Ligand binder design. Structure first.
Ligand SMILES: CCCCCCCCCCCCCCCCCC(=O)OC[C@H](COP(=O)([O-])OCC(O)COP(=O)([O-])OC[C@@H](COC(=O)CCCCCCCCCCCCCCCCC)OC(=O)CCCCCCCCCCCCCCCCC)OC(=O)CCCCCCCCCCCCCCCCC
Ligand SMILES: COC1=C(OC)C(=O)C(C/C=C(\C)CC/C=C(\C)CC/C=C(\C)CC/C=C(\C)CC/C=C(\C)CC/C=C(/C)CC/C=C(\C)CC/C=C(\C)CCC=C(C)C)=C(C)C1=O
Ligand SMILES: CCCCCCCCCCCCCCCCCC(=O)OC[C@H](COP(=O)([O-])OCC[N+](C)(C)C)OC(=O)CCCCCCCCCCCCCCCCC
Ligand SMILES: CCCCCCCCCCCCCCCCCC(=O)OC[C@H](COP(=O)(O)OCCN)OC(=O)CCCCCCCCCCCCCCCCC
Ligand SMILES: CCCCCCCCCCCCCCCCCC(=O)OC[C@H](COP(=O)(O)OCCN)OC(=O)CCCCCCCCCCCCCCCCC
Ligand SMILES: CCCCCCCCCCCCCCCCCC(=O)OC[C@H](COP(=O)(O)OCCN)OC(=O)CCCCCCCCCCCCCCCCC
Ligand SMILES: CCCCCCCCCCCCCCCCCC(=O)OC[C@H](COP(=O)(O)OCCN)OC(=O)CCCCCCCCCCCCCCCCC
Ligand code: SF4
Ligand code: SF4
Ligand code: SF4
Lengths: 315, 173, 186, 53, 182, 49, 117
């Protein structure tokens, strides 16, 4: 009865947690193979059998390796920031729509907006806590990212929301039963991927890491334990944001198998782009968000305010 | 029940907040409390719509002041206060003890949750936030929203004029 | 096509000379790409196309190479088919070695033949230039085919004559084949 | 190259093409940020060892 | 030098087995540690992360090991920038006096267990500039070295062979099995 | 049979050096025109949903 | 909510256990005065990271605070479209988005969106 109900909710979260945690390990392998094939390389192929156990073969090393205690760092902050980076990455999954109920989440769309914003503090605190010049530049390079994508992100979500009528993610299924919103929203799909990259701090928007501009960005002063969680928390973001693209533009048939064939493909796209584009320039992004994306997104609210109004009169 | 424990934590975090000196110590204290107040407000309401909004609004303000803290008050110091840790921990457990032995039907707030409403209330069967946010965009209160718009846009003219961007960056000279 | 801002003389190519047209037919064409990510689209087609190629990786150590008979590698003191060492301690190799990596001490052997009592190469000082094998008038010293002799200690990289002679016996078959197929050029 | 009639050169000065290029990095990249300076460094086309004789 | 076994003699030898400690442990506790010691070594062996030092003209051949022809990444070797996450340092080039304090510090910042590879003659023993007034005569003067890869520059395969020697050296560590005796 | 590395009798063929651009399928009008049509049909099917 | 809080705590405990395993499973070696020194490309650092870091997007930083608080007023739109008067809802919404665009284009034309130079 009701007492039993919440037990199942625990199982689902734990089941979803271990499954996501496992997948991000295998995603990292997939990233190396695919990125190893776009480049004419072969990719990890020796370890174990045909390279499949590679990511596990790395999780051993990052945990048998010593913690680093930076001399000039506020140790408690430096030590805790990895936890909340991983926690916020996993926690945002509880809003992922299931028809076999996991959590109701009316206003689920907002819950996305709150959680994704939090992911910046963990980078921000980690960089400042490390107390290294590069780490601080990485942190403040990450914050400036939020100032850019944050506002445009909400508006673009609002456009999708107008189509469905509510902030509950479940309704995306019903409206994408005949077709896919990709057709109606092609430029937004293309724009949305672009902002999605900023969310997860990937090439061409890789500024928090800032590899080859900063030595390793805000991660420059992390090691075995802390660095691992920072890494996993990174790829959990990709996996979710890839899924959130599949529920919005690609049917949202969560109970069908193909939905998971789609989910991996969008994950491939994220790796695919990393092997194509050079990194933007730190300012060109912020100009891009405010000069083009923000103006672009507002323009279609009118287009969808008119379209919904026009459609309302007929129906 | 957790409402009382939320009462204890918001009190506890407020006591320490009075004693913070380092700006980031203030910020961390404030950020933690913004979570609880956001959580607590949705308990006594028909929906958590406003907790989402409030949380989102303040987080915008949280980032910006770090950017200025990291530029103005970058070099400052912390000091663990054994008086403070004991005092908060002492009262915190003390307060948590009461919440277990409290007549927590009496402590619950009389504000009508969505379930607290009757079954006959026909207006409670619509969308979660339809009616409440409704007259924000209907005659005559809509003009208030319009008034904000100029107020916000006119604000947007105030910052650029106060700021005088062209005369340089900001450094803690 | 648009015109060139600067007229080009003969025997010279310009990289950014053509100006930008201002006809609506072209501005829209630039606008469409700038507006639907058109330039990046073909960039994505190219990279995806490389997924469908045989990767150029070699399964080392099972497959490896290719090399050529002229390859310069580890050293080795050869010897005549009789078995007698070729080196006569002429010391041309020592004098030409740019790195001064060679040390030789020679003495009248018991049977009275000019020979070395010492021949040391400091492989951490050699540069594998190959001047030693060009200067040897009797092909005594050669740079064998081997390139896989990394050690775990610095001392093991200092070859004395016995180590060098051992290589000249382990690698004798292949060196004699490289010299035959290459001496005419040299 | 200078020769004194012996078997060895008397002095061998070597112009590094990048030497001039890096001397000008003081101004070319002035009033630019790291992403640009990193870009400039590549386009200067400096293989060190030239600059360090 | 110990020569390899002949086919007929080798035709009788038992299969080597994976672990270099064999399955001949007397007790359960020893045997479990031995197997558990393999698990560590299998981990560290698999993913060896160089630091991207690249000092001098060995550095170019340290790029072609990552090039598609040889593909260091096939072996789990992944280049990294920060010395904190880097596990191995490949000192490839001529370590001059001006650099020497910088290498020492960068090596120190690397967390244990850290292994050093010396590439080319320059980093091995000072190489072609051994007698220069401003060259450290081999990096082993400054930091401990675990593998020496000769060459000038070492061939790409030569370095690959060096890396595999480091995997085998890692494979046979006795970090746990020696704690038991300690 | 030559005794030295030399060009063949008659010489090697000409080596391509010029830049060849890839196939172009879309112009400004066709791209802008298609998008409006695709959106319009998209709205048409959206209404039925 | 109360379900989510419980799982929020349960996850936080789980992730916390992960490093508490890492802190013990990690190899332990004596810490050196140089091992814990900061990383700044192998040369000692001139400047603490806690010096005042100059800012150039300060103006945008403030504008970001504003533009969000108008996101609080557009989000409710959808929820109240079935229930509101269409003229009032239509008119007000438009003159909400035009006001935003006009504000943006005004500053864009005035050059405030550009960074300090
Ligand atoms: C995901 C990860 C798996 C990746 C895929 C590849 C795995 C399989 C493989 O590689 O087989 C090689 C192997 C072929 O090599 P081989 O010539 O026969 O001899 C193996 C070694 O030479 C002889 O082994 P060895 O004993 O000399 O050295 C290995 C050493 C340690 O084993 C390892 O090397 C792995 C890491 C350490 C052990 C990990 C557990 C830690 C502590 C265990 C003690 C408690 O000892 C063992 O543990 C081997 C005993 C087998 C039982 C495992 C215990 O395959 C097999 O013979 C068996 C098939 C693999 C098992 C499949 C079982 C399926 C069960 C479904 C569940
Ligand atoms: C040379 O030029 C070049 C450069 O210039 C320098 C480059 O920078 C680069 C840069 C390359 C990149 C940026 C590539 C992307 C790679 C990176 C950013 C980092 C490298 C690391 C990876 C790819 C590995 C990915 C994985 C991780 C880092 C760890 C993540 C955490 C994981 C996998 C753990 C997951 C958790 C789980 C519970 C999974 C299931 C269980 C386990 C792991 C348990 C393991 C074992 C046990 C518990 C033992 C139990 C035993 C018993 C009971 C007996 C290249 C390619 C280059 O060519
Ligand atoms: C203004 C806007 C600020 C917005 C950022 C707020 C958070 C910044 C906190 C920075 C660390 C503060 C600190 O140093 O306290 C040390 C305190 C201890 O205070 P302390 O006084 O003992 O530290 C000094 C120690 N001695 C005396 C030895 C010198 O340690 C902590 O517990 C802080 C834990 C921080 C956890 C990481 C926060 C990440 C949050 C992510 C988003 C939310 C999820
Ligand atoms: C559980 C135990 C699973 C492993 C049992 C292995 C039994 C096979 C015989 C011993 C062996 O070969 O182990 C090593 C194994 C394969 O050998 P490998 O080191 O990968 O060399 C390259 C091979 N192409 O490589 C492996 O697959 C070992 C993987 C074990 C550790 C996996 C990490 C998760 C922790 C499992 C506990
Ligand atoms: C010690 C104190 C222990 C008390 C817990 C403190 C940690 C808080 C973690 C829970 C935060 C999530 C939450 O409580 O959301 C509540 C509310 C949900 O409302 P609703 O839309 O109806 O969805 C219900 C679906 N079952 O939605 C909201 O109110 C907004 C929640 C935003 C959450 C941001 C993520 C915070 C992560 C923890 C930071 C610490
Ligand atoms: C994520 C995936 C993580 C995989 C983790 C695999 C862990 C294998 C554990 C082996 C120990 C690794 C840490 C270590 O190196 O400890 C070694 C230590 C001996 O060190 P010591 O003798 O003191 O050396 C002299 C120093 N002056 O050892 C000791 O002092 C005590 C050894 C006792 C045996 C401990 C065995 C622990 C097994 C843990 C399995 C964990 C599984 C979950 C992960
Ligand atoms: C049909 C609308 C016609 C608008 C004409 C605008 C033509 C040129 C726009 C432009 O960007 O040129 C540069 C001009 C200079 O403005 P500046 O202070 O340098 O700020 C950065 C501008 N990118 O930039 C500007 O001053 C204005 C840029 C935004 C104008 C948008 C107007 C849209 C009206 C619909
Ligand atoms: S190859 Fe050159 S540097 Fe090496 S020993 Fe021979 S002559 Fe000397
Ligand atoms: S040049 Fe040849 S013969 Fe002369 S000393 Fe050297 S190895 Fe011996
Ligand atoms: S050992 Fe040879 S290849 Fe390597 S850096 Fe020195 S001179 Fe260059």
């Amino acid at each position: 009865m009701f007492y039993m109900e919440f037990i199942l909710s625990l199982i689902g979260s734990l089941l979803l947690i271990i499954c996501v945690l496992v997948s991000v390990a295998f995603l990292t392998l997939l990233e190396r193979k695919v990125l190893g094939y776009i480049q004419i390389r072969k990719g990890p192929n020796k370890v174990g059998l045909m390279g499949i156990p590679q990511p596990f073969c790395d999780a051993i090393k990052l945990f048998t390796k010593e913690q680093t205690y930076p001399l000039l760092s506020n140790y408690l902050s430096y030590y805790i920031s990895p936890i909340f980076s991983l926690f916020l990455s996993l926690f945002v999954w509880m809003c992922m729509p299931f028809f076999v109920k996991l959590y109701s989440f009316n206003l689920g769309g907002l819950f996305f907006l709150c959680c994704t914003s939090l992911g910046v503090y963990t980078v921000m605190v980690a960089g400042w806590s490390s107390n290294s010049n590069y780490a601080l530049l990485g942190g403040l390079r990450a914050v400036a990212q939020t100032i850019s994508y944050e506002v445009s992100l909400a508006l673009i979500l609002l456009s999708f929301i107008f189509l469905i009528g509510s902030y509950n993610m479940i309704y995306f299924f019903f409206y994408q039963v005949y077709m896919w919103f990709l057709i109606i929203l092609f430029p937004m799909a293309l724009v949305w991927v672009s902002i999605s990259l900023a969310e997860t701090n990937r090439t061409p928007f890789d500024f928090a890491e800032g590899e080859s501009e900063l030595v390793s960005g805000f991660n420059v002063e992390y090691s075995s334990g802390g660095f691992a969680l920072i890494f996993m928390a990174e790829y959990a973001s990709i996996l979710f944001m890839s899924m959130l693209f599949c529920v919005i533009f690609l049917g949202c048939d969560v109970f069908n198998l193909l939905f998971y064939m789609k989910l991996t493909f969008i994950s491939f796209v994220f790796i695919w782009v990393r092997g194509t584009l050079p990194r933007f320039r730190y300012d060109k992004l912020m100009y891009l968000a405010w000069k083009c994306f923000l103006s672009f997104s507002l323009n279609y609210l009118l287009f969808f305010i008119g379209f919904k109004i026009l459609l309302f009169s007929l129906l | 029940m957790i409402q009382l424990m939320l009462y204890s934590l918001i009190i506890t975090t407020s006591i320490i907040f009075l004693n913070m000196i380092h700006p980031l110590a203030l910020g961390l204290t404030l950020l933690i409390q913004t979570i609880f107040v956001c959580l607590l407000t949705g308990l006594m309401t028909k929906s958590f719509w406003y907790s989402y909004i409030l949380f989102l609004i303040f987080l915008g303000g949280m980032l910006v002041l770090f950017i200025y803290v990291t530029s103005l008050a970058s070099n400052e110091m912390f000091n663990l206060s054994m008086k403070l840790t004991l005092f908060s921990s002492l009262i915190l457990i003390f307060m948590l003890i009461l919440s277990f032995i409290m007549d927590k039907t009496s402590s619950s707030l009389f504000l009508m949750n969505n379930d607290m409403q009757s079954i006959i209330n026909m207006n409670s069967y619509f969308m979660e936030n339809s009616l409440s946010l409704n007259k924000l965009y209907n005659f005559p209160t809509n003009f208030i929203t319009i008034l904000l718009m100029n107020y916000l846009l006119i604000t947007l003219i105030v910052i650029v004029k106060i700021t005088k961007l062209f005369k340089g960056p900001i450094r803690m000279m | 096509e648009p015109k060139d801002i600067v007229e080009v003389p003969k025997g010279y190519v310009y990289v950014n000379n053509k100006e930008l047209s201002m006809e609506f037919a072209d501005i829209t064409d630039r606008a469409a790409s700038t507006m639907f990510f058109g330039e990046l689209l073909r960039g994505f087609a190219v990279t995806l196309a490389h997924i469908f190629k045989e990767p150029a990786t070699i399964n080392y150590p099972f497959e490896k190479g290719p090399l050529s008979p002229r390859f310069r590698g580890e050293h080795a003191l050869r010897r005549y088919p009789s078995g007698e060492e070729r080196c006569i301690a002429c010391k041309l190799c020592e004098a030409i070695c740019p790195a001064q990596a060679i040390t030789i001490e020679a003495e009248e052997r018991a049977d009275g033949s000019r020979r070395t009592t010492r021949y040391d190469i400091d492989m951490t000082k050699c540069i594998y230039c190959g001047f030693c094998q060009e200067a040897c008038p009797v092909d005594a010293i050669v740079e064998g085919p081997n390139f896989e002799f990394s050690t775990e200690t610095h001392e093991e990289l200092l070859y004395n004559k016995e180590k060098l002679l051992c290589n000249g016996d382990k690698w004798e078959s292949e060196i004699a084949s490289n010299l035959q197929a290459d001496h005419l050029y040299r | 190259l200078i020769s004194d009639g012996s078997s060895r050169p008397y002095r061998c000065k070597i112009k590094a093409p990048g030497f001039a290029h890096l001397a000008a990095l003081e101004k070319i990249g002035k009033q630019h940020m790291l992403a640009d300076v990193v870009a400039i460094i590549g386009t200067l086309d400096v293989v060190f060892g030239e600059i360090d004789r | 030098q110990q020569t390899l076994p002949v086919a007929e003699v080798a035709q009788n030898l038992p299969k080597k087995g994976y672990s270099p400690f064999g399955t001949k442990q007397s007790s359960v506790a020893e045997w479990s540690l031995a197997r558990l010691d393999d698990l560590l070594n299998w981990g560290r062996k698999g993913s060896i992360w160089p630091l991207t030092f690249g000092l001098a003209c060995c550095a170019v051949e340290m790029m072609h090991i990552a090039a598609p022809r040889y593909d260091m990444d096939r072996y789990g070797v992944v280049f990294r920038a920060s010395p904190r996450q880097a596990d191995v340092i490949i000192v490839a080039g001529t370590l001059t006096n001006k650099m020497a304090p910088a290498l020492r510090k960068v090596y120190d910042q690397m967390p244990e267990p850290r292994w050093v590879i010396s590439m080319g003659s320059c980093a091995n023993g000072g190489g072609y500039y051994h007698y220069s007034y401003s060259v450290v005569r081999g990096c082993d003067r400054i930091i401990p070295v675990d593998i020496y890869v000769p060459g000038c520059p070492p061939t790409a395969e030569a370095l690959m062979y060096g890396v595999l020697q480091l995997q085998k050296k890692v494979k046979r560590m006795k970090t746990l099995q020696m704690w038991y005796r300690k | 049979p030559p005794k030295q590395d030399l060009p063949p009798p008659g010489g090697y063929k000409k080596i391509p050096f010029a830049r060849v651009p890839p196939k172009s399928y879309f112009t400004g009008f066709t791209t802008i025109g298609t998008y409006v049509v695709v959106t319009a049909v998209g709205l048409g099917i959206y209404y039925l949903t | 909510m109360f379900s989510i809080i419980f799982i929020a705590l349960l996850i936080l405990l789980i992730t916390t256990i992960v490093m508490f395993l890492a802190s013990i499973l990690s190899k332990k070696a004596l810490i050196d005065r140089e091992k814990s020194s900061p990383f700044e490309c192998g040369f000692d650092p001139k400047s603490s990271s806690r010096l005042p870091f100059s800012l150039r997007f300060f103006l945008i930083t403030i504008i970001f605070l504003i533009f969000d608080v108008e996101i609080a007023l557009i989000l409710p739109m959808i929820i109240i479209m079935k229930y509101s008067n269409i003229m009032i809802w239509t008119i007000t919404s438009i003159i909400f988005i035009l006001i935003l665009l006009i504000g943006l284009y005004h500053e864009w034309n005035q050059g405030m969106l550009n960074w300090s130079n």
